[model samples]
Target: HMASMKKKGSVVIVGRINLSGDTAYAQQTRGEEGCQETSQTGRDKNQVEGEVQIVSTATQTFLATSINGVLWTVYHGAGTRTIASPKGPVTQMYTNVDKDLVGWQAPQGSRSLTPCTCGSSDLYLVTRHADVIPVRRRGDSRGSLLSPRPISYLKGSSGGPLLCPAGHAVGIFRAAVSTRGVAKAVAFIPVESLETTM
Candidate 1:
C-alpha cells in the first residue's frame, strides 16, 4: 500500500532546434564562395550592395534680372538648381555645402545684384545669381594652387545626378556659374548625409 501511494518517478525529454536562412544583406562573402562550389577555393571576400532612392526632382525657371543678384533656391536633403550667368545655358550641378566658394561671383557684362532683403516672409527665390569662389583649405592638393575665380557661363537645358570620382552620387545639376566661360567648378548636394535622416 505504501509503495503504491508513492508517486512514480519518470524522465521527461524536450526537443529544441533553430533553422533559419541568413538574409541577403547579411550573407557572408566567404559563404557565397562556398555556395559556388568551385574547384579552387582560397580566401573569399563578400560585399554588401546598397540601394539609393531619389526623393524628388524639379526644374525651376527664372529670369536673371541683374548680374549681381543672388541665386536663391530651395535645397532639399537631395539637391538644388542655380542660374549663375546670363550669356548661355544654365549650369547645373549637385548641391554640396562644402564646396569652397570663397570668391564666386558673376562674370563681366552680366548685371548682378543682391536680393531685396524685405520681401515675402517665405522667400524661395531671393536673388538671380551669386558669385561663387573656392576657398582652398590648407592641406588640399587638387589644383588648389590657382586663385579663386568668378563663375562665367550657364546652360538652360542641363540636369542630372552629380557623381564623385568613385561614382558616388553627390548632388543634382542645377545651373551655370556665369554667362561666358565654363563653370570653374560644379555645385553639388552631398547625399551621403541624407542617408542618416531616413
Candidate 2:
C-alpha cells in the first residue's frame, strides 16, 4: 500500500458525486450553521463528494466521507460516546472502507497552517476535476482568494484542497464569490475548523 501513496499528486485529491436527482448544499438564510442542505430528493439519500487524506506521520488514513476526511463522532454530553457514522449518514460516492485505499501521508504535518505567508510559487486550490488554480492568501473569512477568476472551476469545488506553500493543506474550499459571471474571491474553511476528531 505504501507504493500507492506516492500517486497522490498524480491522481485527484478531491472528487464529486453525481446522481440521478440533484445532489447539493446551500447557504443559510438563517441558522446557527452557515450552510444547509437543500438535499438530493432522489432514490439514494446518503452521498457526498469526499476526498482523501494521508497518515498521521505520513498519516495512514482510510477513505474519508468528506467531513474533513475523518470519521464523525456523535455523542450526547458525557452520555454515550458514539462513533457517529463510521461510514456516513449519506455516502453515495465516497463509500469504500477496509480496502487498500485507506490512508495518506505528506511531508508536512496536517495541523493548522498560515496561508497569508506562502510563497508565490506555493498555494493552489486543488479541485475534484484536478484544477490546480493558483490562489492568494487573504485575511478574514475569504482566505484563499482567486484573481482574474479563471472560468475553469465548476460544481462541487466546495471541498477542494487549498494547498499551503509549505506543502500542507491550508484549508478546504468553501465558496467562490463572484459578481456578474466574473469570479472575485473565495471562502475557505481554515485548518483550525477542519476537524475535532483528529
Candidate 3:
C-alpha cells in the first residue's frame, strides 16, 4: 500500500509499498517493571510495520521505473548522498554518462515494456492530477515530442508516463518547454533510448 507522496519542483516522491511477505511486528513500549499499561487510543492501528520496497522520486522531470526489477533515473553528475527507497538503501548499479542515465536495483517488480513508434498517435499523457490527457505525437526531433492540447501541463507533470493506446507505457515525460513559465510542448525520453541503456 502507498504510504505517502509529495511534490517539489519537477521532482516528486511517488510513495512506498511493502514488498516483503513477512508481517512486521510492532515494538512494545516497555516500562521499568516489564510492560506499560495502555488504553485503546487507535495507536495500535497506526503502528508502522512492513518492508517498503519501492520509493519513487522524479528529478528534473526525468523519472525511471523498474525494468525487470531494476529502476533507472537520471545521473545529475554530482551527488554524494545515498538514495533511499522504501525497500531500503539503493546503490547505483549502472551509469551511462553520455545519456545521463543511471540504474538501480529496485526492491519491487518491474513494469511491462512495449515498443513505441516515433510518431504514433492516439496516446495519452498521465498527469499528476491522476488524470490522463490525450496527447499527439509530434514526431521526434530533439526528443520524443508530445502535443499537450487544450490545456497546458503542470511542471510536476514532468517525469510522468506517456501511454500508448494499448495502455502500455511508451515514454517518460522529460521536460515541458515553457514560455514565461507556461508549458508549450512536452518532451519525453523514448522507451527505445531507455531500453538501450538497460
Candidate 4:
C-alpha cells in the first residue's frame, strides 16, 4: 500500500521556470547527470530530479493546463518528462498552496496522498532520481537539515518531498545548503510548516 503511494508522489517533472527573476523562461530537464547547455534561460534553470506528493485529486487522466512554480527541476520516477507553461493545466495544477510543492489530479484509478508530516536513519529520499542513502539530522532550529550525501545531481530536486519509512512526507526538499568544511546538507522544510500553508 505505502509503496504504491510512494510511487504516486514520486513523479518526473519537466517544467519551465525563470527563478522568479529573469524575464526569459528556461527549461529544466531532469536526467542522469546530463550535459551543460545555455540559452534564453540562464543559470536560473533547475535541472533537479524532484518529487511532489499527490496531495489531492478530483478526476482522472485529463490534459489540464501548464503551470510554473519553482519548476526549474525535472525528474520522473523513471524517465524524462517535459511540459510547457501554457499560462497554466492537467488535472488542476497546484503550487500556490505551497511554493515548495506541486500537485495534479491523480489518475482515474490511482489514489491521492496524505502529507506526513521521519524515521530510521536509513530513510529513502522518495525522489524520481532514486538514491537511497542514510542521512543524519542536522540543525538546531526550524525545519531541518539532511547531511552525509552528495547528490549534487539532486540539484533540481528543489521543490520535492522527503518520504519516510511509513510512507509519509516528513518535509519538502528546499535545497542544498552547505559550508566548505562544515555543512553541505540539503535543507528540508518540514511538513508541519506545510500545515499552515495548506
> Top model by lDDT, which number?
3
* Residue-by-residue lDDT tens digits, candidate 2, 27-109: 11212111111111111122223232210111111112133334211111101111112121222222112111111221121
TM-score of each: 0.23, 0.41, 0.55, 0.43
> Listing every candidate in turn, what is its Cα RMSD in Å to the true structure after a full C-alpha superposition?
27.4, 16.5, 12.6, 15.5
RMSD of 1: 27.4
Candidate 1, overall lDDT?
Answer: 0.24
In terms of lDDT, the poorest run of 10 residues in model 4 is 56-65
Query: How much is the lDDT of residue 96 in candidate 4?
Result: 38
Residue 10 of model 2, lDDT score: 14
Give the lowest summed-lDDT range of ten residues in model 2: 73-82
Per-residue C-alpha lDDT of model 1 across residues 1-198, encoded as one tens digit per residue: 777683211100010001122321111222322322211221112221221111112222212111122221223322332222223223333244454211112223323233222322111111112212222212111212123334432232122223233323333334434425534444432232222221
TM-score of 3: 0.55
- Any idea what lDDT model 4 has? 0.35
Q: For candidate 3, lDDT tens digit of each residue in 1-198?
A: 356653221112233222233432222222212111111110111122222211223222223444444554545521221344333344567666555556565433334335555446656765544455666766651222344333354544444457677655566665566567655566766667776766
Candidate 4 residue-wise lDDT, 44-106, digit = tens: 133332233211111111111111232222112111222222221233234433344444433
Q: Return the TM-score for candidate 4, rounded to 2 decimals.
A: 0.43
